[PDB]
Each structure stands twice: as structure tokens, then as C-alpha cells.
Design a protein around this nucleic acid. Sequence first.
RNA 1: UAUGGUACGCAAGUCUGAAACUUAAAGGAAUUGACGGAACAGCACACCAGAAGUGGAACCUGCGGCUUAAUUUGACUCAACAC
Lengths: 66, 100, 221, 140
Amino acid sequence: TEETTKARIMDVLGKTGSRGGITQVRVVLISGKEEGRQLIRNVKGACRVGDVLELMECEREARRLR
Amino acid sequence: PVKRRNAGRSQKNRGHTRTVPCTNCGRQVAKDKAVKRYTVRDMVDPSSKRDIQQKLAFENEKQGIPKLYVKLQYCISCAIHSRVVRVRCAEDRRIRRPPI
Amino acid sequence: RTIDPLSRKEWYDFRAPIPFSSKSFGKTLVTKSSGNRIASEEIKGRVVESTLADLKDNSNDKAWRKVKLVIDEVDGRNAKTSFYGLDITRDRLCSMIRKWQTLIEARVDCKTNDGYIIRVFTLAFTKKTSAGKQSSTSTCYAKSSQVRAIRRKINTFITNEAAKLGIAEFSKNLIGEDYTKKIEKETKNIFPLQNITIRKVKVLKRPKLDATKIAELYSHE
Amino acid sequence: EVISYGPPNVGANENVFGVCHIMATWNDTFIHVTDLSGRETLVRVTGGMKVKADREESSPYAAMQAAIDVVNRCKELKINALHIKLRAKGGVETKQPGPGAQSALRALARSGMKIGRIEDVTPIPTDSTRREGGRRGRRL
RNA sequence: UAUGGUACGCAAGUCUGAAACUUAAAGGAAUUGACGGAACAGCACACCAGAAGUGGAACCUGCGGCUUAAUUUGACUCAACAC
Ligand SMILES: [Mg+2]
Ligand SMILES: [Mg+2]
Ligand SMILES: [Mg+2]
Ligand SMILES: [Zn+2]
């Protein structure tokens, strides 16, 4: 199944992972199939606000940090 | 050095209280003493939830997957080891209705 | 594959009795007649555990009521069933069980004029009035004596409403919300009660059905 | 061609309902389908069938393989949908279903099997005979 | 514990109950450390994203062994061993 959505970061929220290698992030979608939808995603690598992200599922939404 | 005034069990005004087997080990423990937490969880990982809720034959379900009800009763050794309860400072030790 | 193990198997459609939908609900499997084994007769005593998936209109909300049916008859590749039991999901029970109130339970033994002996278990809970959130502070308990009077009353009423009705009648009433309304009205003097429930029904002694009464049970509109 | 000794007359609208008794133990998992009666058994799969290691018997991998075997086999019996009855060893023993529980439930629907009503039937003592532990339980 | 019990017990034992002898401590709560195969929280290239690699080879140079008339000697986890 290949279907893909562009996702732009509004806010950098947390920092997470066992080693602490991942970043938690809030996201607004630009696909056009789902627009302006918001999501919370875990991203590996270094990210700023307002990056774009290639997302294979807009259904998987990451567990928020406490 | 009396540690607790309670002495750990909630029992007063009686000689004897029924003993319960610990969930984890099965050791007999006093029903007052036992660390008892009632658990309502869901049978299924949220992802797994998505997968199943797709395939549910009866669309008339609104939260139409059952929760799992557990009355969980721990002996002390177990509930300490297993972190259900953990060591606190003398002052906090008497705090009664703590969670969130 | 060599010789699918179900090679010998005949299927039958279940048919529900008078309170329920005439439409088949499930299907069952049985081995073919061996010349000793008579296909229809191997199924005489089987027991079906279903929800109300069985009342077309009213079903969808009550997944909470289990109904046992037993096959009285085979007609032409589809198996007719009579009333066997009533019951409840774990969920709908531990749903209702709360700390800081009193849990009342009431068991009764009754006869139909239909010739059935039934055992009905009833469940009830203490209803808080005082308007706070029930808690360690908000204790709701009813006195043990009040509980006893509540039993006596519930029980009595059921035995009365049992003796005057057929099992069709009785079961229909039992599944639905009628008895809960009445029971609250009897009970309220002694103590306000919340979510009265018929926890289970067992059929102790069941007469065999004449062709007549099994026809009259079928009677579907 | 395909002779399916399952039910004679179906449709695309129709639902064919089997029932899945699933037992999850800390030591194993059982995926067992029958008819609505429970009498006539259709499919049977245990974790131990699917792995050679005594310890893996319970695991999600095993539960998955088990599940897909069951599904594949219902599919030819023309069965869309299983009701689910979930169970841990219960009685005097633990009431927490094992690890394979979730995994098998998922892998069943993952395999394109519809899912009917779900109940937990775990054996529940009104009251118990005495537990297999010591008076002091398992030490260590 | 010994012993005596017209004190008990079928028994296990219960009740009653010594002294000789020996000894400067044993003991109670609490403080501070140290420690923990307890709980929590920091920090460091500790790990994480990576890189260059040693460990494998020949050779060089230290240790240890082993031979030796002698194989001078100090130094063995970081915190000995191209010191
Ligand atoms: Mg005592
Ligand atoms: Mg009051
Ligand atoms: Mg054991
Ligand atoms: Zn324990």
C-alpha cells in the first residue's frame, strides 16, 4: 500500500526515546485529502518548527509524553 | 520504633480478618493489609483497537468492545517489588488520597 | 487435502421462539445419519448461547442480555428452539458494581402455569440521593434489615407475576424493562434502588412440548 | 473445483457466524472455533503447534501464526465472522489473560475476518478451593 | 534448662520452676557516615547519531611465563604493562 501525505510541523513538543534520540512534534497536514488536520508524531532526526515530513499513515498518532 | 500507627492494616474493632491469596505470588495476606487496586483496562493495544474496530460486524457498537475488569490484590513483598507501591519519606508516609 | 473432515456434515438454521425474531439467527453443524445415528435426533438436547441479536428492531443496544435456547424440534433442515435461560455479560455486571453502596441480591423459585419451574436471580444497588459524588465520604449503605425487606418484597412479587403467566409471557416481560419499573416502585419505600437487573434465569424443570404448544410458541407475525 | 462442506446457502449480504474460544495462559495460547452451540468443533490451533521451543508457546508470533491458520481454514468453510470468547486459565489461577491474547485477537481481524460480539469468560469462583502456591506462595 | 510436683495430659507437652558457674556489657530510642542484588533525581563521549579504529596479520616495544651462571628491579581494574 503506497499512499503518502506531506506533514508540516507547527510545534516541537517533547524529547523522547530510551536513549532520547527522538523528538515529539505537533503537525498540520497538507495532502488535500486531509487538510488542516492535526496530529502528534514522533520524529527521528533533528527538526525545527515548520519543516515538512513525509507521512505514510495519518492514522498512526503517537502517544503524548508525560 | 513503631513504624506505622496503622501498622499497615486498616483493621480495627475486630480480632480477625479474612486472608486473601496474592495475585502475583499467591501468598496469603490480610485483606486489610493487602494492596488492592481495581483495574479497568481495555483488552487491546490502541493500534490493535483500530484494526478490530474496522472489522466489527455490528455497526451498532458505540465503544462496543468490552473493558477488562480486574480486582488486583497484592501481598506486600510483591506490591513493593512490582512497584505498585513504593518507599516514601516519613512525612509523606501518612498521605491518604494522593493520585493525580 | 484428502477427504475434508466435514464431508459428512449437514447444516441447520436455528429458529427463535415467540418473544424473538422468526428469522434464523445462527447455523449449526451435525454429522449425517449413519443408519443407526438419526441426524435430527443427535440435536435434541443442544444449547445455544446468544445475545439479543435475536430481536430485529430492539437488538442493537442490548448486547448485555444473554439468552440460552434449547432445540425442541427439527423441522425440515431447520432446528426450532424453546426457552432455556437468561443471563448477563461480565461487562454489564462489573459495569454496575461500585464501592460505597450496598449490593442487594435476590433469588426466587417459581412455577409457570405453562408447567415450567424457573429460578430467578435479581440484582439491585443502593441509589444515592444526597447529591454529591459517591465516595469514601459519600457512603450510601442501606441497613441489612432494609435489604431483607427488599428481598422479601422483590421475591414475593416475582412469584406472583410468575404463577399467572405462561413462559412466553414471563420471558418477554423478563428480558425487557417492565419488571425493573415495577420493582423500583415496590422497593422505593424501603430504600431507593438503582439499576435493578435480572442477573440470571435458570430453568429447573421443563415439560415436553406437545405439537400444539410448540406450534403456539411459533405463531410468528 | 471447491467443495466446501460448510453451509449450503449463503449470499454476499449474509453473515456466517462461527464462535472463537480463545485461551491465553502465561504458558500458551488456544484459538478454537466452533458453531454457536460449541458442540461441533471446526478449527483448533495452539501456539505449541506453531513453534518448536517450549518457551515460545505463548508468544505473539505463535499466536499470529495460529490465528492465520484458523482464518485460512474458516475462509474455505465460508465463515465471515467469529464471535469472541476470551479466557485466561482462571478459577483459582490468574485471571489476567496471557501475552498471546491481544496478538491473536488482532491477527484474526488483520486476516480479514469480521468480528462479532466480544465477551470475557474467565472462570470466576464465587468461592475458591485453595491455591496451588504455598501458604507463602512462590518464593524467588 | 536441672530438679520436685497425692498439678494436669493417652501422648506430644502445659503449668509450677531453680542454683552452681560465667560475664561488663547485653539492651532502647535517635544522629551522622558508609553500604544495599530499595525508590527517585542529576551529571560526563557514559550512552545516543556517527567516524577512525584496536581485537585478526607481519614486525617494534613493554608485562608475564619459560629457559639462564645472570636473564637486576619497582609497578598489576580504571589508578601496572613506549610507565
Ligand atoms: Mg489475633
Ligand atoms: Mg448517611
Ligand atoms: Mg505454580
Ligand atoms: Zn505476592
